[PDB]
Ligand binder design. Structure first.
Ligand code: HEM
Ligand code: HEM
Ligand SMILES: O=[N+]([O-])c1ccc2cn[nH]c2c1
Ligand SMILES: O=[N+]([O-])c1ccc2cn[nH]c2c1
Ligand code: NA
Ligand SMILES: [Zn+2]
Lengths: 400, 400
């Protein structure tokens, strides 16, 4: 009943006993594995389980306080169909959700998370203020700090609060007449939506998009982040002098804003969170994916590489230097960043810590292993077990 | 019912209808995914299914010959508890087994497999002759040809033919008294077994191991491969002149010899197959894996790289050049080899062919994506479905 998990580099063996307690069910079946794919009484059950987790965490399970809390939750759900989380529970819940995220390699930092309680938010304007304060705190002038802001939970009698943008800071993507895209191709849809809602666009490759914020049962409202709040880093290479001339740059703060936070059966459709970048996401994914900025060929040509044949590994060489530039640039600008070697090494420690703590750790191998130099990192040689635990961060349909 | 499979680079969508027809079951459940883990009547149902597959392949399903064959097989099983394959079925079966291997990126060449029928093999000595013949045919002085030699099947009241070695060509691994290992650490166990059975061990880093061949109900017999039959490639770099001095080398023929070929319920414990190398297996895994030759640091030092900090990406830079050396060296020696870019590109074509041919393709994402520069290849951005189809190549316990 317990999956044997082996590490092929050292040969060590462990058994995931935590998986046996996975809340929901994934896409896999004994007939076929779908691991590579990206995407009343029920409420009470989840609520009771979460409360049990909370009291267990503070070493007070089975106490009068524990029993009282369970009774209160039941009473509220019986009377309103929902319930109110206590401040301390929201904090605990948010940390667990990050802890439970199978695709996150930076989980060793799970317990260090600043939680901003915005459950009293009433308007899009107030949403904006909350978001600006989050960005300010999180950016901390380069010494990034992990944070999450939680807006009002989904209610049975009203619409949801939603942040239309996928991240708080993203670059516009403008479709050109010739069929090409200026800016980030991943952001074409949201870019066009902003324009449709009244935003006169820029014409650059790195235009910070306005926020399209939605209050319950109301059309989304446009808000522009003060430039002074958006910390960016100009990209240069330590030896390749011409690299800085490409005019490339990236933002400091990776802040996912389109996921749903689930705590004890309660759902928070708007709960943006942020940490700091692992260099490969910028250097490899954002800059080199064929469907993103796709700068590989241009960089290789500037590096005087032989792009005539694949065997020269011109692509690999260019990607490595682009990653070097990202690391060099962030360190120079004094903006928090972590390379894939340091990040994966820290995750191995996280796995060890979690084995002792809960007897396992939900991890998605395809996402944990970096987009470049996979086998050069320890996680590549580590077998993993992927499963769903709650509290959790979940994907949800776009509000439009 | 039919899993939706998406390519994230192009946005194309397909449905794997083939998976719903997968015979055997895998390790995954809706509770948890174990996709990253490395490891009479029943016979008749498997036999009938395979016979049906064969007749469908020659467009004669439902014919008198088809029915007569099904009846013939049923009669044989009732009279002996097993049955024999016709040569044409054996050839078809072997090809399907390769076609069905989820972890193989070279499947576009599946139809070109040359199948050698060695079911008439009478002894370990004859087994050796067959193996040497295979090596000669397959190597072809550098112009590699894919092939498989099928030895007698497993049958009741008789032992099995077995090749103890994991591959026909492997380098010895000598555990030094100081804890280290001279040669390939992955081959320590097999090296020590060869020694026990009377082999006089060498002391080099690249000593070609002898073959430990087992005939039914007989102890394994030692056989030395004539040096002239084992084609090897000395490794050098196109610009780094000192690389050649490292004395690195690798063999031309990758020939897996410890897997079990399963066809229509029948099992062939000894059926060695071979193709040609994808450069990353040698350059990245064999030479750079921590638990293998682990030459990364030494090469980085010779390259004058700053090995003090991980953020300089010295590991990545060294790995790329080692891979360049491999490609350059095999091309210079005129020995067939394929880089990861060309291999993955060909696999995308194979997926397209298979979608039209069978409505799907069992593929293990974790194994298909190369150990370096994953996202730089098209397969990384392609969702895959992993399932078991028969005929198939399966892992089996070591004979000892
Ligand atoms: C402290 C620095 C952090 C690092 C280095 C880190 C790194 C990563 C990486 C590399 C990914 C995969 C690529 C991607 O999804 O774009 C990821 C995914 C994820 N991370 Fe973390 N992370 C950090 C902080 C956080 C925080 C603060 C939270 C939440 C409180 C979090 C929640 C998640 C979630 C939910 C995902 C999955 C996103 C998805 O499925 O698209 N991470 N993280
Ligand atoms: C012709 C060129 C070929 C190429 C470039 C190729 C490449 C690969 C690669 C890269 C792997 C990954 C396994 C590893 O990491 O060692 C693999 C696995 C595999 N290949 Fe192919 N292959 C070829 C031919 C063949 C042939 C001729 C067969 C069978 C008739 C075959 C059967 C398999 C099987 C069964 C596996 C799984 C082995 C394991 O998991 O240990 N391959 N191949
Ligand atoms: O805070 N996050 O969930 C998050 C998401 C993606 C990346 C990439 N580098 N760092 C990250 C942090
Ligand atoms: O013969 N094979 O199945 C096989 C196994 C691993 C590799 C790596 N490059 N080529 C290969 C062929
Ligand atoms: Na990003
Ligand atoms: Zn799975």
């Amino acid at each position: 009943k317990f999956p044997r998990v082996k590490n092929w580099e050292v040969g060590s063996i462990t058994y995931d006993t935590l998986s046996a307690q996975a809340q929901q069910d994934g896409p896999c079946t004994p007939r076929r594995c779908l691991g590579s794919l990206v995407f009343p009484e029920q409420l009470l059950s989840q609520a009771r389980d979460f409360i049990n987790q909370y009291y267990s965490s503070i070493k007070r399970s089975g106490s009068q306080a524990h029993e009282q809390r369970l009774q209160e939750v039941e009473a509220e759900v019986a009377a309103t169909g929902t319930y109110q989380l206590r401040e301390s529970e929201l904090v605990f819940g948010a940390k667990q959700a990050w802890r439970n995220a199978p695709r996150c390699v930076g989980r060793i930092q799970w317990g260090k998370l600043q939680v901003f309680d915005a459950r009293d938010c009433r308007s899009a304007q107030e949403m904006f203020t909350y978001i600006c304060n989050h960005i300010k705190y999180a950016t901390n002038r380069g010494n990034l700090r992990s944070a999450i802001t939680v807006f009002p939970q989904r209610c049975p009698g009203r619409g949801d609060f939603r942040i239309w943008n996928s991240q708080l800071v993203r670059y516009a993507g403008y479709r050109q007449q010739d069929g090409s895209v200026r800016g980030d191709p991943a952001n074409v849809e949201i870019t066009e939506l902003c324009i449709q809602h009244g935003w006169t666009p820029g014409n650059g490759r790195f235009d910070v998009l306005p926020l399209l914020l939605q209050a319950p049962d109301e059309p989304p409202e446009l808000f522009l982040l003060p430039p002074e709040l958006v910390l960016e880093v100009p990209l240069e290479h330590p030896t390749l002098e011409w690299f800085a001339a490409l005019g490339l740059r990236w933002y400091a703060l990776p802040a996912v804003s389109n996921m749903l936070l689930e705590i004890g059966g309660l759902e928070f459709p708007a709960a943006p969170f942020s940490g700091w970048y692992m260099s490969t996401e910028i250097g490899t994914r954002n800059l080199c994916d064929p469907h993103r900025y796709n700068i590989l060929e241009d960089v290789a040509v500037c590096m005087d590489l032989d792009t005539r044949t694949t065997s020269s590994l011109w692509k690999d060489k260019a990607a490595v230097e682009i990653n070097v530039a990202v690391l060099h640039s962030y360190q120079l600008a004094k903006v928090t960043i972590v390379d894939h070697h340091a990040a994966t090494a820290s995750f191995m420690k996280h796995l060890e810590n979690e084995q002792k703590a809960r007897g396992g750790c939900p991890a998605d191998w395809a996402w944990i292993v970096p987009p470049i130099s996979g086998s050069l990192t320890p996680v590549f040689h580590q077998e993993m077990v992927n499963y769903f635990l709650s509290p959790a961060f979940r994907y949800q349909p776009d509000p439009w």
